[PDB]
Amino acid sequence: LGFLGAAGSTMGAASMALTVQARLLLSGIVQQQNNHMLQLTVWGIKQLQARVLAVERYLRDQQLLGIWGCSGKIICCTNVPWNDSWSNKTINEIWDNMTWMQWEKEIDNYTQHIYTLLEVSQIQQEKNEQELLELD
Amino acid sequence: LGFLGAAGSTMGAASMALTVQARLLLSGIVQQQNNHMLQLTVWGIKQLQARVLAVERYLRDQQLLGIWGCSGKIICCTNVPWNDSWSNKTINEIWDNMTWMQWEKEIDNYTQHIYTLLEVSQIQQEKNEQELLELD
Amino acid sequence: LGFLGAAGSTMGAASMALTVQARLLLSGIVQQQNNHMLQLTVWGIKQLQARVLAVERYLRDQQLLGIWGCSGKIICCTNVPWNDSWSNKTINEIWDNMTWMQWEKEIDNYTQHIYTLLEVSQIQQEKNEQELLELD
Amino acid sequence: AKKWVTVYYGVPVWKEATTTLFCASDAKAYDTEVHNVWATHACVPTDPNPQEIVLGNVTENFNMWKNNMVEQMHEDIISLWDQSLKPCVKLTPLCVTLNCNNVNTNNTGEMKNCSFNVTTSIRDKIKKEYALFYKLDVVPLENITNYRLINCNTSVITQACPKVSFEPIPIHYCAPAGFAILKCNSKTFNGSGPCTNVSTVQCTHGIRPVVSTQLLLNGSLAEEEIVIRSENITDNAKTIIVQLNEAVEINCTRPNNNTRKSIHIGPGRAFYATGDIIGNIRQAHCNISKARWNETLGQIVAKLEEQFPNKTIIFNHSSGGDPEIVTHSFNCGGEFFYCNTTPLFNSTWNNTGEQNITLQCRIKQIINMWQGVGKAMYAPPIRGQIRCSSNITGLLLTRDGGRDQNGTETFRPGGGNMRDNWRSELYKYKVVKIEPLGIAPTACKRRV
Amino acid sequence: CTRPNNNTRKSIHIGPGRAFYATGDIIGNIRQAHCNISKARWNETLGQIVAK
Amino acid sequence: GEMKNCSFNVTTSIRDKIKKEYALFYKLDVVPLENITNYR
Ligand SMILES: *[C@@H]1O[C@H](CO)[C@@H](O[C@@H]2O[C@H](CO)[C@@H](O[C@@H]3O[C@H](CO[C@H]4O[C@H](CO[C@H]5O[C@H](CO)[C@@H](O)[C@H](O)[C@@H]5O)[C@@H](O)[C@H](O)[C@@H]4O)[C@@H](O)[C@H](O[C@H]4O[C@H](CO)[C@@H](O)[C@H](O)[C@@H]4O)[C@@H]3O)[C@H](O)[C@H]2NC(C)=O)[C@H](O)[C@H]1NC(C)=O
Ligand SMILES: *[C@@H]1O[C@H](CO)[C@@H](O[C@@H]2O[C@H](CO)[C@@H](O[C@@H]3O[C@H](CO)[C@@H](O)[C@H](O[C@H]4O[C@H](CO)[C@@H](O)[C@H](O)[C@@H]4O)[C@@H]3O)[C@H](O)[C@H]2NC(C)=O)[C@H](O)[C@H]1NC(C)=O
Ligand SMILES: *[C@@H]1O[C@H](CO)[C@@H](O[C@@H]2O[C@H](CO)[C@@H](O[C@@H]3O[C@H](CO)[C@@H](O)[C@H](O)[C@@H]3O)[C@H](O)[C@H]2NC(C)=O)[C@H](O)[C@H]1NC(C)=O
Ligand SMILES: *[C@@H]1O[C@H](CO)[C@@H](O[C@@H]2O[C@H](CO)[C@@H](O[C@@H]3O[C@H](CO)[C@@H](O)[C@H](O)[C@@H]3O)[C@H](O)[C@H]2NC(C)=O)[C@H](O)[C@H]1NC(C)=O
Ligand SMILES: *[C@@H]1O[C@H](CO)[C@@H](O[C@@H]2O[C@H](CO)[C@@H](O[C@@H]3O[C@H](CO)[C@@H](O)[C@H](O)[C@@H]3O)[C@H](O)[C@H]2NC(C)=O)[C@H](O)[C@H]1NC(C)=O
Ligand SMILES: *[C@@H]1O[C@H](CO)[C@@H](O[C@@H]2O[C@H](CO)[C@@H](O[C@@H]3O[C@H](CO)[C@@H](O)[C@H](O)[C@@H]3O)[C@H](O)[C@H]2NC(C)=O)[C@H](O)[C@H]1NC(C)=O
Numbered sequence: 001l002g003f004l005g006a007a008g009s010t011m012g013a014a015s016m017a018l019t020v021q022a023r024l025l026l027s028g029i030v031q032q033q034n035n036h037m038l039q040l041t042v043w044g045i046k047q048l049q050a051r052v053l054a055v056e057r058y059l060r061d062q063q064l065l066g067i068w069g070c071s072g073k074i075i076c077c078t079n080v081p082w083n084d085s086w087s088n089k090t091i092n093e094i095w096d097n098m099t100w101m102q103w104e105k106e107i108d109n110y111t112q113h114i115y116t117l118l119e120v121s122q123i124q125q126e127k128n129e130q131e132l133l134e135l136d
Numbered sequence: 137l138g139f140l141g142a143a144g145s146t147m148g149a150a151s152m153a154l155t156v157q158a159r160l161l162l163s164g165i166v167q168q169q170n171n172h173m174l175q176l177t178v179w180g181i182k183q184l185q186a187r188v189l190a191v192e193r194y195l196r197d198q199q200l201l202g203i204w205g206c207s208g209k210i211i212c213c214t215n216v217p218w219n220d221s222w223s224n225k226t227i228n229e230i231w232d233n234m235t236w237m238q239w240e241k242e243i244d245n246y247t248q249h250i251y252t253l254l255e256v257s258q259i260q261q262e263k264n265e266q267e268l269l270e271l272d
Numbered sequence: 273l274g275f276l277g278a279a280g281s282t283m284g285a286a287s288m289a290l291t292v293q294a295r296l297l298l299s300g301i302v303q304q305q306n307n308h309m310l311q312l313t314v315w316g317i318k319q320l321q322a323r324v325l326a327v328e329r330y331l332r333d334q335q336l337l338g339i340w341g342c343s344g345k346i347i348c349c350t351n352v353p354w355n356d357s358w359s360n361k362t363i364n365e366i367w368d369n370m371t372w373m374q375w376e377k378e379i380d381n382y383t384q385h386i387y388t389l390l391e392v393s394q395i396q397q398e399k400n401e402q403e404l405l406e407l408d
Numbered sequence: 409a410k411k412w413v414t415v416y417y418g419v420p421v422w423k424e425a426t427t428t429l430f431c432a433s434d435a436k437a438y439d440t441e442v443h444n445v446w447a448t449h450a451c452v453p454t455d456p457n458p459q460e461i462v463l464g465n466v467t468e469n470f471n472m473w474k475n476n477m478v479e480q481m482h483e484d485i486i487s488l489w490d491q492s493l494k495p496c497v498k499l500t501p502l503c504v505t506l507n508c509n510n511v512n513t514n515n516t517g518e519m520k521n522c523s524f525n526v527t528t529s530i531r532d533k534i535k536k537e538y539a540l541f542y543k544l545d546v547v548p549l550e551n552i553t554n555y556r557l558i559n560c561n562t563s564v565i566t567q568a569c570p571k572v573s574f575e576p577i578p579i580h581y582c583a584p585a586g587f588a589i590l591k592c593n594s595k596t597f598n599g600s601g602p603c604t605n606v607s608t609v610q611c612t613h614g615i616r617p618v619v620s621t622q623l624l625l626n627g628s629l630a631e632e633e634i635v636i637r638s639e640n641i642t643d644n645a646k647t648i649i650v651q652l653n654e655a656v657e658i659n660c661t662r663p664n665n666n667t668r669k670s671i672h673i674g675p676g677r678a679f680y681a682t683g684d685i686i687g688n689i690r691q692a693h694c695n696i697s698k699a700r701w702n703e704t705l706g707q708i709v710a711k712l713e714e715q716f717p718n719k720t721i722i723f724n725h726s727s728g729g730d731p732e733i734v735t736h737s738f739n740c741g742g743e744f745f746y747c748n749t750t751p752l753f754n755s756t757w758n759n760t761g762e763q764n765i766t767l768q769c770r771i772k773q774i775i776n777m778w779q780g781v782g783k784a785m786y787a788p789p790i791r792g793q794i795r796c797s798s799n800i801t802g803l804l805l806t807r808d809g810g811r812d813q814n815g816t817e818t819f820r821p822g823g824g825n826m827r828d829n830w831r832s833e834l835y836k837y838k839v840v841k842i843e844p845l846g847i848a849p850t851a852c853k854r855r856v
Numbered sequence: 857c858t859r860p861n862n863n864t865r866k867s868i869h870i871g872p873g874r875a876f877y878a879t880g881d882i883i884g885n886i887r888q889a890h891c892n893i894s895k896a897r898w899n900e901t902l903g904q905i906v907a908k
Numbered sequence: 909g910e911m912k913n914c915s916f917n918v919t920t921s922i923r924d925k926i927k928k929e930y931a932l933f934y935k936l937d938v939v940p941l942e943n944i945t946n947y948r
């Protein structure tokens with residue numbers, strides 16, 4: 001559906017196509033061939049410094065999915081309840097009305113407190129319960 | 137069985153040992169110690185530029201397995217049917233005859249169309265069906 | 273519980289909190305903003321060379337979990353039996369007595385032989401059995 | 409029977425491609441000599457256990473002449489040669505007026521008692537200094553001989569590195585992660601083609617960076633026959649490299665015993681030149697065996713009878729050229745030796761300690777090797793002893809014009825390239841890109 | 857944009873190796889560079905500039 | 909025109925020997941300081 005080709009469309013239609021937004025995110029139309037006899041020019045330095053910032057934005061979120069059991073797929077749920085105090089709108093309502101665009105501007109605040117809680121109930125509690133529950 | 141020590145052997149014996157081909161692929165006999173008082177020499181520049189191309193070849197395929205539910209293991213199947221028009225040879229036949237070597241030269245053409253179809257039936261359809269099917 | 277805030281505490285209390293030890297391990301208090309008009313100074317070279325060594329230590333272990341079916345979580349068991357010749361102490365005994373600190377100094381020796389065996393019983397045997405067992 | 413797509417990672421399949429490589433070197437002198445021009449202070453180290461995995465059933469076609477590793481070695485050495493000596497003394501204001509005579513005895517050598525103007529420690533005060541140098545380093549222009557230096561024309565000269573070994577050590581090449589170097593440890597080679605026993609290595613052979621024309625000094629010696637490297641052969645015009653089966657030892661000395669003369673050019677900067685020669689006037693003196701060489705030539709003339717038509721006329725010496733091009737120009741102990749290739753091609757034959765064999769030896773200090781139109785280098789003299797402990801690891805040949813048919817096709821040494829010098833080392837190498845992702849259908853699928 | 861100043865090549869070496877290239881000799885009549893432009897086209901472009 | 913027949917001292921191939929050379933240049937490239945026009 002195109003790179004960010006679902007950003008305009010509502011959350012429901014945005015969750016419908018979000019693989020392309022991660023597909024062309026790394027090696028798409030920016031990777032290229034990457035081809036006086038020296039490569040220490042202004043274009044050589046700029047491409048390698050940008051390469052470091054390229055992986056940094058991917059790995060930051062990649063590590064999080066890995067410590068949530070959501071690493072194996074694009075969309076995976078967790079065993080974390082939603083504290084009503086964060087957002088008071090209906091599940092189905094933001095999906096055809098608010099859109100991911102405004103929605104990120106709503107969570108961004110408690111987003112770090114959400115990430116903190118996501119680590120324990122789904123991994124620090126769920127995967128730590130396995131140690132005893134695996135053999136019975 | 138050795139780094140690429142199964143390339144000669146048929147697909148069946150090649151699928152038997154393919155972990156070593158990924159094990160020595162990154163930090164094996166090429167990583168090393170990585171040890172006038174400066175490290176801006178011709179060997180310093182060459183090692184770091186090669187390091188960028190090293191991860192690039194791994195991450196390109198690593199991202200694909202992550203968006204197929206095959207990230208958790210070396211060999212994992214998908215819910216994608218094989219269009220007979222791509223290849224007409226018997227499953228068991230290429231595994232003891234053709235070998236991965238010639239086989240890659242057969243798929244490489246529709247390989248991008250295969251990757252496009254692999255994303256939707258196994259992730260954009262299967263994992264998107266979960267949104268409603270997870271709680272019932 | 274803090275970065276390495278469980279190293280002092282026994283293995284049982286160390287396995288209780290080991291997500292923070294991987295959380296602040298990459299982009300915590302070392303990432304920063306990363307902000308004559310040129311960035312080729314002594315601080316620019318030192319930060320990018322350190323960035324290469326930063327991912328190298330993560331990816332080495334990240335590849336191993338990926339080839340063990342343990343990629344999806346922090347703690348995941350395997351189908352590998354423990355050869356009594358390696359360690360003769362009781363399971364519950366090292367967990368409240370020896371601590372991970374001394375324990376790493378005990379396994380480090382057979383650690384490569386352990387990694388070699390971990391690849392085959394859990395992946396080269398278990399995931400290779402699936403090829404025939406998936407459809408029946 | 410219900411074909412479903414199965415994803416496989418770590419598939420042993422390669423694709424022909426070229427990537428940026430890096431060093432692999434073992435600890436040499438460690439204490440005494442710490443940084444030699446090639447290895448420098450910080451070189452990527454080598455592992456004592458290389459991946460010797462040999463792949464059966466693999467007949468991969470190797471490209472000898474069209475190998476991209478050869479071009480990588482060409483750019484690395486020159487860039488390093490420009491880097492080396494950059495922080496050293498610039499001889500830009502040194503080049504001045506030169507007035508001289510010959511020796512105290514009327515030629516019974518090739519040195520000239522020259523006088524000149526050099527700015528001492530203080531810029532304002534000027535001192536007239538007398539110093540030695542070898543032949544060809546100066547060119548005439550005008551009772552007294554009045555001439556100029558060869559540098560001023562062409563390039564800015566700089567004084568070379570002090571106490572830095574300009575002698576090679578085994579420099580192995582390591583390909584990065586997700587890439588592999590295909591090793592060809594096959595017996596015969598017909599100038600590129602399909603091999604027998606292709607191997608997979610992540611670390612190459614102990615290739616020493618060869619700095620010579622005419623003869624090859626280090627490296628691969630493929631046994632039982634002399635290997636003919638053919639870039640091109642049907643057409644005479646193109647260069648032909650030949651690998652030897654057994655090494656032909658060559659001694660290289662210089663019984664010219666020189667002292668140390670230091671003259672400061674402006675503030676701090678120190679210029680070191682040839683002092684005074686102690687003893688009798690004599691040539692460098694390389695030396696070689698008579699019969700051993702003849703024996704090596706025995707199979708060379710026999711192989712060319714098989715490659716080229718019948719027993720057609722085929723002998724002559726190096727044609728035209730400048731000193732560095734037509735003579736066996738090589739680094740030995742520090743200085744550059746320019747010995748003659750005339751007593752070799754003196755033998756005309758059709759049907760298939762030791763002996764005193766030497767060549768017209770001459771020394772040269774002004775050296776901007778590989779034609780350095782920017783930064784020129786002054787070779788510093790070596791105080792005392794000059795030893796060899798080197799080898800013959802091959803040679804370079806040429807054409808016989810563009811004669812149609814005929815019975816005359818006289819071959820001589822006219823190989824004027826540095827890339828072809830490492831083509832007797834990287835002949836067995838070809839870099840490949842590893843493709844671990846593989847798609848294969850089989851009767852199995854996934855469920856809910 | 858033209859320059860009907862027709863100049864030859866004069867090379868003078870400054871010390872060793874280094875070569876300095878400067879204006880040689882102008883062949884023909886003495887004249888200005890001569891860029892040139894349209895009268896009406898510009899006027900037409902200016903028409904909407906003053907209106908805006 | 910706007911060109912000036914200038915003379916000057918340029919160190920030739922040899923540092924010791926000095927040769928007086930004549931070369932062309934365009935207007936504004938030089939600025940006055942002092943029978944004969946003397947500038948920098
Ligand atoms: C293929 O590659 C090889 C690479 O190994 C090429 O090898 C050639 O080897 C020879 C023979 O060794 C080189 O010449 C000499 O090497 C000497 C090694 O010295 C070491 O031990 C020293 C102890 O000193 C005492 O013994 C030495 C014996 O030579 C005496 O010279 C000395 O006066 C003492 O009595 C250490 O002090 C030293 O540092 C080493 O650890 C060197 O000693 C000798 O170097 C002199 O000059 C050096 C300049 O920096 C100086 O540092 C040394 O101290 C010393 O005074 C000298 O280099 C060849 O140079 C070398 N190169 C070539 C191209 O021939 C092989 O040739 C090459 N080519 C092929 C096969 O064709
Ligand atoms: C090494 O390089 C050589 C390059 O010469 C290469 O072999 C060449 O192949 C071409 C194929 O077209 C040969 O061309 C013809 O050969 C015939 C037979 O002798 C001639 O009669 C032809 O004459 C043509 O050219 C003349 C000169 O311009 C014209 O006047 C005339 O009208 C024709 O156009 C033409 O030469 C060529 O001869 C060979 N070279 C030989 C046989 O020496 C060879 O493949 C390479 N070898 C390897 C792989 O080592
Ligand atoms: C979370 O839900 C609560 C409770 O429903 C929201 O708090 C308050 O909700 C009342 C709803 O009756 C808001 O009153 C509104 O007043 C406006 C203006 O007079 C009127 O037009 C509406 O019809 C309604 O009566 C009240 O403003 C609101 N208070 C505030 C300041 O938050 C709560 O806002 C929801 N989510 C958030 C953003 O925290
Ligand atoms: C955190 O929740 C708050 C709750 O609304 C979100 O907005 C907050 O809004 C106020 C008022 O707009 C902010 O005040 C700011 O003052 C500066 C002064 O320079 C002004 O430039 C801004 O335009 C703004 O008026 C306040 O900072 C802001 N945050 C908090 C924590 O109270 C906010 O978006 C949520 N998310 C984040 C990222 O914190
Ligand atoms: C996909 O399967 C089809 C159908 O079986 C292949 O298409 C055609 O298959 C026939 C099989 O009878 C081929 O005929 C062959 O002719 C040769 C030469 O006369 C003969 O020796 C064989 O015994 C056979 O009779 C035919 O060539 C083939 N057509 C082409 C050009 O493809 C099809 O090729 C298979 N896979 C591919 C590569 O698409
Ligand atoms: C895509 O499927 C085709 C089907 O055979 C595979 O091969 C195709 O083969 C023809 C004929 O060999 C190719 O023509 C080429 O012409 C150039 C002209 O310079 C010549 O150098 C080549 O040797 C070749 O004769 C054609 O390009 C090629 N591809 C297509 C798309 O028709 C092909 O391997 C499959 N895979 C890929 C990577 O496309």
Ligand SMILES: *[C@@H]1O[C@H](CO)[C@@H](O[C@@H]2O[C@H](CO)[C@@H](O[C@@H]3O[C@H](CO)[C@@H](O)[C@H](O)[C@@H]3O)[C@H](O)[C@H]2NC(C)=O)[C@H](O)[C@H]1NC(C)=O
Pocket residue numbers: 359360
């Ligand atoms: C693995 O378990 C075995 C067998 O229990 C350990 O091997 C040996 O175990 C005996 C236990 O009776 C040790 O004897 C000890 O002698 C000391 C000093 O006289 C005494 O204080 C103890 O009460 C006990 O009787 C013996 O030293 C030990 N042998 C060695 C050298 O290993 C084995 O050590 C265990 N794990 C290891 C580290 O391999």
Ligand SMILES: *[C@@H]1O[C@H](CO)[C@@H](O[C@@H]2O[C@H](CO)[C@@H](O[C@@H]3O[C@H](CO)[C@@H](O)[C@H](O)[C@@H]3O)[C@H](O)[C@H]2NC(C)=O)[C@H](O)[C@H]1NC(C)=O
Pocket residue numbers: 377380381382
């Ligand atoms: C491998 O298992 C051994 C079994 O104890 C662990 O220790 C071994 O201990 C001996 C004696 O302490 C080591 O000898 C060493 O000699 C050097 C000489 O310079 C000295 O500096 C050391 O302090 C030490 O005495 C021995 O090397 C060592 N290893 C082996 C393989 O026998 C060892 O920690 C285990 N782990 C590893 C990483 O190998």
Ligand SMILES: *[C@@H]1O[C@H](CO)[C@@H](O[C@@H]2O[C@H](CO)[C@@H](O[C@@H]3O[C@H](CO)[C@@H](O)[C@H](O)[C@@H]3O)[C@H](O)[C@H]2NC(C)=O)[C@H](O)[C@H]1NC(C)=O
Pocket residue numbers: 520521522523538539540
């Ligand atoms: C070229 O060779 C000549 C050899 O004639 C070198 O210069 C000459 O050096 C000698 C001794 O070093 C000078 O003779 C003595 O000088 C002392 C002290 O000044 C005086 O007390 C003695 O009575 C005697 O005159 C000799 O005069 C000198 N030549 C001249 C005319 O100055 C010269 O350095 C060599 N340099 C090169 C390689 O061009």
Ligand SMILES: *[C@@H]1O[C@H](CO)[C@@H](O[C@@H]2O[C@H](CO)[C@@H](O[C@@H]3O[C@H](CO)[C@@H](O)[C@H](O)[C@@H]3O)[C@H](O)[C@H]2NC(C)=O)[C@H](O)[C@H]1NC(C)=O
Pocket residue numbers: 598599600601638
């Ligand atoms: C190294 O030596 C081998 C063995 O001689 C070379 O193989 C030869 O390759 C050429 C083309 O590169 C073949 O020429 C053609 O053969 C066909 C067969 O039908 C014929 O119809 C043509 O008129 C032409 O003669 C040649 O046959 C073949 N060897 C034989 C059996 O004679 C190989 O290319 C060599 N490497 C190089 C490029 O120097």
Ligand SMILES: *[C@@H]1O[C@H](CO)[C@@H](O[C@@H]2O[C@H](CO)[C@@H](O[C@@H]3O[C@H](CO)[C@@H](O)[C@H](O)[C@@H]3O)[C@H](O)[C@H]2NC(C)=O)[C@H](O)[C@H]1NC(C)=O
Pocket residue numbers: 912913914915930931932
């Ligand atoms: C400035 O313009 C003057 C033009 O007067 C340029 O210098 C003059 O060049 C001419 C010819 O190139 C010299 O005349 C002839 O010299 C030859 C050989 O030396 C002689 O055989 C003839 O009889 C005749 O004298 C002329 O003397 C010379 N002017 C002087 C006084 O030396 C000058 O090069 C221009 N340079 C700039 C742009 O400043």
Ligand SMILES: *[C@@H]1O[C@H](CO)[C@@H](O[C@@H]2O[C@H](CO)[C@@H](O)[C@H](O)[C@H]2NC(C)=O)[C@H](O)[C@H]1NC(C)=O
Pocket residue numbers: 504505506507523524525536924
């Ligand atoms: C170094 O400078 C001195 C300065 O005296 C030179 O001596 C003069 O040389 C020129 C010709 O080159 C003669 O015309 C003078 O008559 C000399 N003077 C004396 C003292 O006789 C000296 O030759 C210069 N050396 C060089 C070659 O640079």
Ligand SMILES: *[C@@H]1O[C@H](CO)[C@@H](O[C@@H]2O[C@H](CO)[C@@H](O)[C@H](O)[C@H]2NC(C)=O)[C@H](O)[C@H]1NC(C)=O
Pocket residue numbers: 460462591592593594605606607608
């Ligand atoms: C070419 O085939 C030969 C055998 O036919 C391989 O030769 C052996 O290589 C191993 C590598 O460890 C050595 O230990 C043996 O001693 C070799 N045998 C002898 C004496 O020839 C060879 O390695 C193959 N080629 C390549 C590319 O490696």
Ligand SMILES: *[C@@H]1O[C@H](CO)[C@@H](O[C@@H]2O[C@H](CO)[C@@H](O)[C@H](O)[C@H]2NC(C)=O)[C@H](O)[C@H]1NC(C)=O
Pocket residue numbers: 665666667686791792793
């Ligand atoms: C060149 O030959 C001379 C002649 O022997 C050597 O000179 C000796 O050098 C040593 C070094 O300390 C002195 O102790 C001797 O007294 C010298 N002898 C004499 C009479 O000169 C010189 O060593 C030789 N070459 C080099 C550069 O070592």
Ligand SMILES: *[C@@H]1O[C@H](CO)[C@@H](O[C@@H]2O[C@H](CO)[C@@H](O)[C@H](O)[C@H]2NC(C)=O)[C@H](O)[C@H]1NC(C)=O
Pocket residue numbers: 915916917928
């Ligand atoms: C280049 O150097 C020469 C050296 O002779 C200059 O000629 C002298 O110029 C000065 C004034 O600039 C006069 O006082 C002398 O009388 C001149 N000598 C002669 C031969 O008449 C020449 O002018 C210099 N050129 C420049 C402009 O650098």
Ligand SMILES: *[C@@H]1O[C@H](CO)[C@@H](O)[C@H](O)[C@H]1NC(C)=O
Pocket residue numbers: 229230233234238
């Ligand atoms: C095996 O693969 C080769 C590759 O060309 C093919 O020619 C042969 O027919 C194949 N055999 C079968 C039918 O598996």
Ligand SMILES: *[C@@H]1O[C@H](CO)[C@@H](O)[C@H](O)[C@H]1NC(C)=O
Pocket residue numbers: 547560561562921
């Ligand atoms: C020396 O450099 C000059 C500068 O152009 C050149 O004319 C001359 O020919 C060079 N050397 C020779 C060939 O004598």
Ligand SMILES: *[C@@H]1O[C@H](CO)[C@@H](O)[C@H](O)[C@H]1NC(C)=O
Pocket residue numbers: 657659761762
């Ligand atoms: C030249 O080198 C050979 C090889 O060591 C040696 O045997 C021979 O004696 C040397 N020459 C002399 C000085 O005799």
